[PDB]
Subunit: 595 residues, 3 copies
């Protein structure tokens, strides 16, 4: 039940030879350079080789967990849009930056680096005309159309701080995130299209903004052109604003530690935290993980099927793939629209070389039956990635058997919003995989197991407890927006000297890491990171509810105040979908007399 790198990962059959290979010892030889007291050399070289800098840095790293003053390359300056767009445009303008796989397959097209750069510059000029300055927050409420990348990168280009809100969030959820970050500008769309259905985004925006007193300008992408309300003065059409502007905009020269984005994320306690990532270390971590975990080569076509509203979309749709100058997929549809062949129809149409998805999507397709995958080529694929949650053994094999035809590496990538980039994963040209194991830590990641009853490291193999990291890494989140106390309390205080992931883990006799799962009240349902406390708070607000308990699929047990039962389950399911979002409805709601 151990899977050595298959021929597609040995440079055989004309494929690109792996960056790291061919065995475990070859991974350790490199990894040892990236951790410990003599690792600055490797990190300084990779930083200078991977990114284009305006000013060089002097100091590789400083700071630490205790006070949350982590620093990487502090004196250097750079721009994330320059590194993701301009520098590749200058070398090969007509290269496809984005494969835009529209909700309807026949509406898909390739977007060149030139076209993406031009649209990013126009949007940036629009934002500057609204008075957006370096360090201002800008909220983004966009579905999976390719212009979402232009939106993110236009903010990065001028040094604004984008805060992307998942297009599956409700009006109240959008409003809360818009208000927390105090942005004065919101970028959205008239409607979204997903799985053949319409998302009334502008309608949701108008309801949210009724209680957002700081928002002054809304830029509206005309994705469908159907009639939506537009407030005079406040609301402008993306195409009409961009048509006034030049198709080039200079890049703001950003410090390595200037904030790049806020991304609101659920914790075990309290409301969603605005997780803040800075610029150089985050960009470096995503570029290096993309190159090494997926063994990306210059002509690859990388298909991350995630959503830009989540950290997986930030790191492995936009920043990672574009920093590397390759082609990245922006997938607007679902895995089963029009049919469950879609993922494989897509792979064959574009000859995708890697595919990155959640264990849930894989399990759903396995439910729909092997008819939809057994008769495709898929030989373009070399690596199949999984992220967001444990992948079951049956899913791992099905992924390897059908999607991979037993010639692909399966990289099980463990990480979190707060880690910025992948933390534990097999390198696919070197590591033999066990189904369900993340295997070995990535470069810069020194992880350990701690007994929670003790607070001390369990050294050796065949141990189990809580996962922690010994030392900062370049892409670690730097703060929680305007709430640093919560950052320290959650991640740095439980085990002083270490970073606390919040997951359980075990290291078997071979040193393979096995991610047990959250030891707190965070649950992963279909790859999404949901707090049981937020679901209870959503349910508690329903008129008549007296006490709720939500436990990890999500299941809620509710008791009503003394003032049909299946019809009540639906009204509470709608209450959760209204407070959080449709994706957050519990799998079952049980009405009991006492908890």
């Amino acid at each position: 039940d151990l899977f050595a790198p298959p021929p597609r990962m040995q440079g055989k059959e004309g494929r690109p030879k792996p960056h790291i290979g061919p065995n475990y010892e070859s991974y350790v030889k490199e990894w040892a350079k990236t951790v410990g007291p003599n690792s600055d050399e490797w990190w300084a070289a990779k930083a200078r080789e991977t990114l284009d800098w305006y000013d060089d840095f002097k100091t590789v790293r400083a700071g630490g967990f205790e006070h949350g003053d982590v620093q990487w390359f502090p004196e250097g300056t750079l721009n994330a849009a320059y590194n993701c767009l301009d520098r590749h445009y200058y070398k090969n303008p007509k290269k496809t930056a984005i494969i835009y796989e529209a909700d309807e397959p026949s509406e898909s097209r390739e977007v060149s680096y030139e076209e993406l750069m031009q649209e990013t510059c126009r949007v940036a000029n629009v934002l500057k005309s609204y008075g957006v300055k370096k360090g201002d927050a800008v909220s983004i409420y966009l579905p999976m159309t390719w212009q979402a990348a232009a939106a993110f990168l236009a903010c990065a280009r001028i040094g604004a701080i984008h805060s992307a809100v998942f297009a599956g969030f409700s009006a109240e959820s959008l409003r809360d995130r818009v208000n927390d970050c105090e942005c004065k500008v919101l970028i959205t769309t008239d409607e979204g299209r997903r799985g053949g259905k319409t998302i009334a985004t502008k309608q949701i925006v108008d309801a949210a903004l009724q209680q957002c007193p700081l928002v002054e300008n809304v830029l509206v992408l005309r994705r469908t052109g159907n009639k939506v309300p537009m407030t005079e003065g406040r609301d402008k059409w993306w195409d009409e604003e961009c048509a006034k502007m030049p198709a080039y905009c200079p890049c703001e020269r950003m410090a390595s530690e200037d904030p790049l984005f806020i991304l609101y994320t659920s914790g075990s306690t309290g409301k969603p935290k605005g997780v803040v990532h800075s610029t150089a270390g985050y960009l470096l971590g995503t570029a290096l993980t993309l190159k090494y975990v997926f063994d990306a080569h210059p002509d690859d076509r990388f298909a991350c099927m995630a959503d830009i509203g989540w950290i997986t979309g930030h790191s492995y749709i936009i920043y990672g793939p574009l920093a590397n100058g390759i082609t990245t997929a922006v997938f607007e549809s679902t895995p089963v629209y029009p049919t469950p062949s879609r993922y494989w129809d897509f792979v064959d149409k574009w000859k995708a070389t890697q595919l990155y998805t959640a264990p849930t999507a894989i399990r759903l397709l396995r439910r729909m039956g092997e008819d939809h995958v057994k008769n495709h080529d898929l030989s373009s694929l070399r690596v199949l990635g999984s992220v967001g949650e444990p992948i079951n053994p049956e899913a791992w094999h099905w992924y390897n058997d059908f999607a991979g035809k037993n010639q692909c590496a399966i990289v099980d990538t463990y990480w979190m919003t707060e880690t910025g980039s992948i933390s534990i994963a097999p390198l696919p040209g070197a590591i033999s995989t066990k189904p369900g194991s993340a295997t070995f830590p990535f470069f810069g990641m020194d992880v350990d197991i701690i007994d929670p009853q003790t607070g001390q490291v369990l050294e050796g193999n065949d141990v189990e407890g809580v996962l922690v990291a010994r030392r900062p890494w370049p892409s670690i989140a730097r703060t929680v927006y305007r709430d640093h106390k919560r950052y320290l309390e959650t991640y740095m205080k439980p085990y002083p000297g270490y970073f606390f992931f919040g997951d359980g883990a075990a290291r078997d006799y071979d040193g393979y890491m096995w991610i047990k799962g959250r030891v707190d009240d965070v649950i992963n349902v279909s790859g999404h990171r949901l707090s049981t406390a937020e679901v209870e708070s959503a349910l508690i607000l329903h008129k008549g509810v007296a006490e709720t308990a939500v436990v990890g699929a999500v299941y809620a047990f509710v008791t009503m105040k003394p003032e049909k039962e299946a019809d009540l389950s639906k009204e509470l399911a709608i209450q959760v979908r209204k407070v959080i979002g449709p994706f957050a409805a519990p799998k079952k709601i049980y009405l009991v007399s006492d908890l």
Copy 2:
């Protein structure tokens, strides 16, 4: 023999080619030319500046010519189609550092500006030190008003030397200056102030020009009644005469500057950060935007090479800083090169028509640059005003703004140059940033009325407007286009990029469209013969304005003319001529009717029967812009009976002349 003909000239073609004269051969102690001595030396250098291997030359010139804070990596990118032209994008620099600080550090007492005041006795030299100190003071004042990098600042200043300090103070802090000709109407000023959305305006109490007062502050007050965004007005006390001053909003330049230090740091600007907006006038005011490095490099290189400027030169561009010619060849080009530049406050005829030449001999100017309208005006006034001057300090005489008739070219050559100067006919536009086609004076043998050959970085073609296709070879005529971007091309029209693309990039896709008709003759010389909109199509013969206007001025007594087309049942269009005669010409001994017949006969001889004017109107003057362009569109619309659709003419050189034309046409 040839399809393309030179502009009509009384001199035979075989006697009409002018080699670089001894002052431009390094003789008589003059500087050796940077490019010389012949056409082959021009081609050898120019070939380095165009085509797929020309990055090397442009990168070297960029690094040699300007002082940078950060080097660039990329030489050029982008293009016409979407209007994303980029040059040296990763570099950073500052225009004020390059025009002031670096020269002040080497020679603080060198004269930066010869300030020739309206009254000659008030003129004086302004050192680089003084100019830099005043620039820094104004920059500190602007910062105190909260002006930040990228904010627009309007400038409504007449031709006193502090106008350069106001431009360069904006550049020093990265504000975008938008300069409006002093004397423009309140309405024309308002439209430009509102369009650029500036919050600060810089002006004078009054200007003085030709012994007349320009009521700048009163005009400003009228304009700002309809400009709600302007919060601060800085008022230079040019005359000290009583003007209204609004409490809070308005402050005296001297009182504000006296509070500030005389040094200010330079903002580090990206190459592509906007340097200025410059409004030109057939629709709404068009705010032409130039960025920083490519514009500065183009003005510096053209000033050096087209005028063959050397370190001790005293360069006399006689234009106004409200015109692109003053932006590029008064302020940015000469000061970037560290030489001495003239700021001329007066007119070519105040106190007398000897003014230009009194000025040349007083200051020993080494080059003079003006417009054909000024040249035709001085020619009209007679030779006594020039013949008894020295003028030998001059080596190059330049002409800009419209075609120069060979008759006017010979006058310039004979009297201003005494047949010992090179004449550079410099063709370009606000949108090109710097000179596009011109003789290099140490290399090119000139033909009267020809711009001759494209400048470094300019690769131009002729398109047949009837087919949309490029005409190959020599002896072809059509419309002028450029094949590739050049460093100083305008980057956009302010907040109206669609107008930029539709005006310049859409008419001939793949090319830049100038809007001028042009010909490339059998020797490869370029002739720019008038605006495309001004062409007159008589029975299929397409006549350029320059050729017919050049024929008419061959007649004794003619001072200046303009020809326009009017619809005609038999010939499609017919030529109509507006003719100004010298003041002494006796219009009783030659009635209006016999003059017209002599003029028509002369046009037929040198051009052809089809070009003879159907009707001729004698007028005391022609409608012109402040810069000297003849407003043929106005004349064409009046002949068409559309005198009520003319537009905003409140700010032309003399709006009263429009009523005279309307009366003479009726």
Copy 3:
């Protein structure tokens, strides 16, 4: 046959020259001096720093001493006449990076600040790491208030260590700090807050100094009723006693910094961006820029105090004074050494306090004002004689002439005759020390600043002719020939006042406003303010010479002399004299003491200098900087107490009422 005489001393001139002692010779385990061992070694180096070939030295020192983000091209430009002085203009840097980040990266646990709290038990060491984290948190707070590069921020903080974090947080983001002595009146604070047009003010709930509370927040509340531009106040919870807090406007420093990360990027500042405004007494906002000022404070700290990497530098002044700007915060921290922040007074809880501090922390240099030295001398030797103090190598004096009698007390009891004494002359407007001994090189004379610092070329001008007096044995007014890197660049929004005060009196020169003499050995003697000169029967008298003569009498603690108009001699000397506490006014009646004091002046200087009238007073009116306010005394003697102005913020306003009573 010398026309210039040393300040009156009881020691014969032949026994009054002090070579660098063993602790400044590299003996006794102490570091070798950077410049030594004699005068020749000083002048050899100094010659590289002035004149037409000095660019090379200055460019090298600038690049060696500071960390730059962008190198400069031009070393210097501009000048006095128009006030356009420039140094290193194209370079970019950040003062907080140079005072914190770069040392934190080298040794984060090295002590940056010895915080000597008002109560000794509360003193502690603050690491570079801790100081940098605090600074960054405050910078992030200021950024959240919309503070941009080039905005002014007022600071009204007492001598707690966080005042350094507040200064450097402003520098980190490129804001311009304006610090105001804690305890200045609401009116004085208001005038300075209004003049700099700041929108943010940083203060404490209260200050603690000498066992007394300073009601900083109460004063701030009164000032801000007349400061319409201030929108945010950040309040450091120093004492925890209840103080009013205005909703919206006022926020607690700890509560604000707890929201923010403990790192903030540095704004990349041009060399000539303003670093700070510092008001002196209309209030004059002296402006310093960034690179030249920082370089000047770093070089003077290193060379005048012979600072080495492990030194523990104890400047006992207040950050409200330029001395605290340059020699508590910027100079010592730019050099990466340890610096003292002293919250107390020299006599709390007892006058042993300085020496308790020196022995507790093993201070290697001590820097204070002559007023403090004479105060400790007044309290007698029991408080100092039985301390160790051997960790000290250099004792500095700044702010006014140091009388030779007090110099010797400093030398004998604080230094135990084993320290170099550096009498450092400079001004708020010079940024850093202008004339001082280099302690490993110069043999000192009591009361003499000795020789100009690197980059300072000073001359003496005869004020009657406007002409430079060349050579030695000359006296007149002190001027500087050429700009130096740390010169003030303007007076805030009043450049005309800057030019008229400093640059127009003697065109081509900088006018200090002090009288000076250069003796036969070339030693400079700063003898008092030009405005304080007294002219008796054609004899021009400086304050320092007459006050130095008076303090030679037993039991005198401190004096001040001023002129009184006289019909027959033009002016007459009037003197105000404070005596030691144990001096018996019953054994020596006041009338007899005053006669003795006048006889002593007549013998040492001459009859024209002998006071015509002597007033014994309990103390003298002094600024918070320690300056004796002779103008106030002069106006009272002249019957002009109505024109005194607002003195609500001098050290003790009650003393003016005593003086008025005695002169009446």
